[PDB]
Write a protein that binds this DNA or RNA. Sequence first.
RNA 1: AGGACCGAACCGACUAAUGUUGAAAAAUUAGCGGAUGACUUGUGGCUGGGGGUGAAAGGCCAAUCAAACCGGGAGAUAGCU
RNA 2: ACACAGGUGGUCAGGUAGAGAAUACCAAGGCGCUUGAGAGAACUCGGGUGAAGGAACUAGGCAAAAUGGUGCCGUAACUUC
RNA 3: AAUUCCUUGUCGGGUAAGUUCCGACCUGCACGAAUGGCGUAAUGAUGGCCAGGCUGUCUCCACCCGAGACUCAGUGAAAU
RNA 4: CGAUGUCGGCUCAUCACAUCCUGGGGCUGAAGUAGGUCCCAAGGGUAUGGCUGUUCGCCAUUUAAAGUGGUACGCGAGCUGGGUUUAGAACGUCGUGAGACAGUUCGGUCCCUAUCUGCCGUGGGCGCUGGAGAACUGAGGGGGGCUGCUCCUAGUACGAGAGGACCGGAGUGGACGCAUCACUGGUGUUCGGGUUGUCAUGCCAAUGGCACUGCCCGGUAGCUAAAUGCGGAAGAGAUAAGUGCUGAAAGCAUCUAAGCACGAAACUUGCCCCGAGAUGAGUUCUCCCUGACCCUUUAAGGGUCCUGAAGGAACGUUGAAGACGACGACGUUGAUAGGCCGGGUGUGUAAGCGCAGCGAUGCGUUGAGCUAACCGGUACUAAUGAACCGUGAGGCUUAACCU
Lengths: 120, 209, 114, 56, 122
Amino acid sequence: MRHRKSGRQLNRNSSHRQAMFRNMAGSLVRHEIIKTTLPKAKELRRVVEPLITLAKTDSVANRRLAFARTRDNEIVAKLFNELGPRFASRAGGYTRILKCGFRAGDNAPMAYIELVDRSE
Amino acid sequence: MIGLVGKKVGMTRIFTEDGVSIPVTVIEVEANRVTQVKDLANDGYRAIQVTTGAKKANRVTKPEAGHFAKAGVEAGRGLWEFRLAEGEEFTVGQSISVELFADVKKVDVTGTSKGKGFAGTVKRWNFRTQDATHGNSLSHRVPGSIGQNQTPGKVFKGKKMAGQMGNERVTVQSLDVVRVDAERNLLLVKGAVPGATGSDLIVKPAVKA
Amino acid sequence: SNIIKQLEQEQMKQDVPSFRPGDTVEVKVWVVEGSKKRLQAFEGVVIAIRNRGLHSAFTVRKISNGEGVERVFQTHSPVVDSISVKRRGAVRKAKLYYLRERTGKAARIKERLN
Amino acid sequence: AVQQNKPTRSKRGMRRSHDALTAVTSLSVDKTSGEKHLRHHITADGYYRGRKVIAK
Amino acid sequence: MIQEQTMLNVADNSGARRVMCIKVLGGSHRRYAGVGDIIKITIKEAIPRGKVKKGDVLKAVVVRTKKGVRRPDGSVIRFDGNACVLLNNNSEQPIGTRIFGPVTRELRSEKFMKIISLAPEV
RNA sequence: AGGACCGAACCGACUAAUGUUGAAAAAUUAGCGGAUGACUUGUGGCUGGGGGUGAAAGGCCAAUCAAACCGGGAGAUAGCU
RNA sequence: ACACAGGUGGUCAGGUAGAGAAUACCAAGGCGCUUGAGAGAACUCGGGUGAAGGAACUAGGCAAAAUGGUGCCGUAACUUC
RNA sequence: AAUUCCUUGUCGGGUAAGUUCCGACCUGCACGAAUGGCGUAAUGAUGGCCAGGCUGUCUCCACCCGAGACUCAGUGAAAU
RNA sequence: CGAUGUCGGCUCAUCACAUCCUGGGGCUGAAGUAGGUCCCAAGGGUAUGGCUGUUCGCCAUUUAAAGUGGUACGCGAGCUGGGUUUAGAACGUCGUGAGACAGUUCGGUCCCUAUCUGCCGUGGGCGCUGGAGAACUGAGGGGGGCUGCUCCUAGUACGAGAGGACCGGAGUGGACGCAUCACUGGUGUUCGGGUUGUCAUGCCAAUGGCACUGCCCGGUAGCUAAAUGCGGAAGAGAUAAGUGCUGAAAGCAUCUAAGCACGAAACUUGCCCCGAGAUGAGUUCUCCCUGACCCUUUAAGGGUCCUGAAGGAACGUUGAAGACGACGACGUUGAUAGGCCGGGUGUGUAAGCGCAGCGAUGCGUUGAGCUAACCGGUACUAAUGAACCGUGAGGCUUAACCU
């Protein structure tokens, strides 16, 4: 029963959902656009907007955070290095949500999530 | 008796040197500005309507908007109708003052209880459950049996089963007023009043204590 | 935004020191007797941190002979007179409540001078 | 398991009480794309209300 | 709480080593007793020296309890263990002479000056 | 050294739970009982129905037993439903 | 009988702690378990935590909880020694 | 007494209170000496009994959390 | 007997009254106190253990009180299986034996996938007679009702005396239920910290996976209660029981008959929660609709144009609203859900840096560092419109107004 617990639970066990969204956040900063279900897309803002705000600053020992969540050089050569100046002028606003109707012949609701500086 | 509409904002305790904490429920009262007084033809009984803040009227349908037009389209939380015995009160802007609760200490408060969603088959009746050790099938959390075999062949209306609990319209009639402020609309009453922060409350003077 | 803070002002004490667990302060009270109101002190060590201003329950362990007895004081209450820091301790935990089941070598407190 | 008798023909009508669920009226037109769209969904050109919601 | 089968030590002079609560009774479904409220107690280990013996039922009151005491100004006071005092059955007062350990103000309502007169600071 | 104690392989079932239109006409989990021995196991052979085999239960003998499985006598017989 | 909660003869086996075909995390290496997507309600199947009291419960401390390693100090009634 | 009908036999001990438990009786309507009677230790997935350790067994139940319940789209039963 | 399952254990009713308690009267071999007894009354409330399968009974004790019977001696598509009543084995019993035990014991099985009548909640619809949006009444319906000790009245009444009470007022509690988060506890994988083992990010710091949520310890936000707190009243109508006057039949007498006044924890109310399906729809307020043509005297029906209202359904940001629905807020006439900014926050002195010590490690920088759930701000991100459903003054009758 939701007495005051904010937001969503989101589907799948915590033990999978966590690993999956930490992997998919890597995929989001790698490709700068993601297609998935509407509840998953609406929850891909969660702790990722704060992570863009965190990867923007240059303050000391900031690299301690998300340190086990990003390990590949092909994104670690961009985060904490050059991603920040792309997402600093818009008072947040790092990403937009969009509904993408349903799947073909199937009633699962799809979505699209995009980073606002995507230019590659 | 007149009814003053307000809002629960939390709790404090008033403190004493006597060794009593005196928990108080904190209430903010509305400007109960008055928009109708009955009689002088029609109804046959004397009663009053207060009007309780404002809402977006951009928005608001004509059947309600023609019922507010005598005072502008504000309405807020509602009109709330109560009987007012033999008082010669005017029909608009009469603005009933909360300051009476400094002269009278006994008050009757109505509101809504805890938002629980499910009501609970046990928690509406708080009946002792069947044993959970050594077995029990699908029934560890229900208020006993709703009937018996074999002759009755029915479950009666009025049987203590299921029901509705939480988000109920509930009254408390043993309150004592610790402070009222007419300028700040601030009301303090002894003990716990049903509901949570932001919950709507209505207070009237009590008939006994 | 809520008027509980405007109701804090008329209850909240201003003559109150900064404290952490293992501090010593000597708490004074009027024993809750409504007649002759005698002042009495209580010696012990703080096992409290209050977290906020007015929500200060102020737990103390009496210790006396080296171990024993626990009390909450509610130091913003009109039944309470005063506290003034006699010595300060040192902590690496919020309220240090393990002092109810550890002693000596395992609960030295120290002063740390930092 | 038990059933007293075969259910009445009214009983499917008593379940299926709603016809088409909605007004089911015809789809929306936009001058950015040569094909109709649903209510709040995006055009084939990546637009809504004349504004570019998505690049391509 | 102090209820059926609760084991206590004795906070009185030449008492028994272990005493067990057998009943609180008197209800209206009485559950437990606070400090200073009457209970029925049995002896389980006595160390007989000319006062106490095993296999005997008497009435008692609790003077110290791990659960502590409540009442004034929302305050709570807690202690480290459970201790009892045994009462005379026809002639009033405790069977010994004294009270052990920290004591409490909740025992100040007792009908006799000896037990409310204290070297303990409470 | 070991018809000892621990314990994986293997062997076996004291309890609680699951399953008996169940995945399955015996399988599953969690604590396990044993575990160089009167041990257990891979492979083949020998023993057959009023007879086998059994530290021997109307137990086991391919879901089956106070006589199994298949066929024949057989369209058994029924002062009865 | 099944694209079956299972079974099937031979065979191998490295770090780190350890005597480890114990138990933990991993190498070499494989797999993400054959409808999917929303939801996230009391409740059920099952785990984790619990004030103060404790076997009072129950046919039955049944279950649950705790105990759990090695060496040294130390160690009774009874005994087929 | 794994035996006693009537027997909670009657009694000591164990509990506040004990049909059971522990030790007796000699009254075995009816045990009994290889259809063996008498008896003890490691020990037994052996019945009963006494205590502690630990304990949501119980007192009064609370909170937390997978998988199902709920609602979809696909495939789509049945005893009756 | 072509299936209607047993004993004990227990969560759960409801009717009867030969009434356990209170409520009321009468009598006593009732001085007072305290018991015994009768008829009159049904509202609530009506206790815990030892041995045992125990119902029970005996033993050990409470309470104002711990009453009795009926409901397939209510309660296995309710649970449990100790007891009863077979499958193994034995003691006692019975037989030569196959076998048997209203004697004992170690032991033992408890199956259920809601179709429908039943009930609870949650929506969609119908009716007030055109439609929309609602209110206030109250025909009715439910909930409650039970209680101690003590002080004062009072050592006063009774009564040589000793002993020893009303009504009435007050003090202080027990159970029972309900509501809160100021108080006080538990809990709290979305967060801070202590830590062992190992693995990993090339490497080493550092940070993090896995090992019960690896363990150990805290906790904002939330949940709840043991924590906090509150109550069934008072008044009124009729009436039994019961107290009575006046007064006949029966010159008397008589509470009843006429006449006149009283009165119960039951009844009717009150109180509290629902309430016009009260189709008996009462009464009232706000909003809206003030179109007609053709056809046959046709007042009985039909077709069709002109023209659309009040409002509703729908798409959304989604909640303190939640089973889905619904209800509620908000959709730039914008703070509804987030970010961001400014913060609240619980935790407990980071990482890098430096220095000392043979090193482990410690010390100074370091009131350090880090945060979800709470709050204001900020449009930074997001929140189409047609169409659709719904109209066009709506049956009769009398007095009247205007026409």
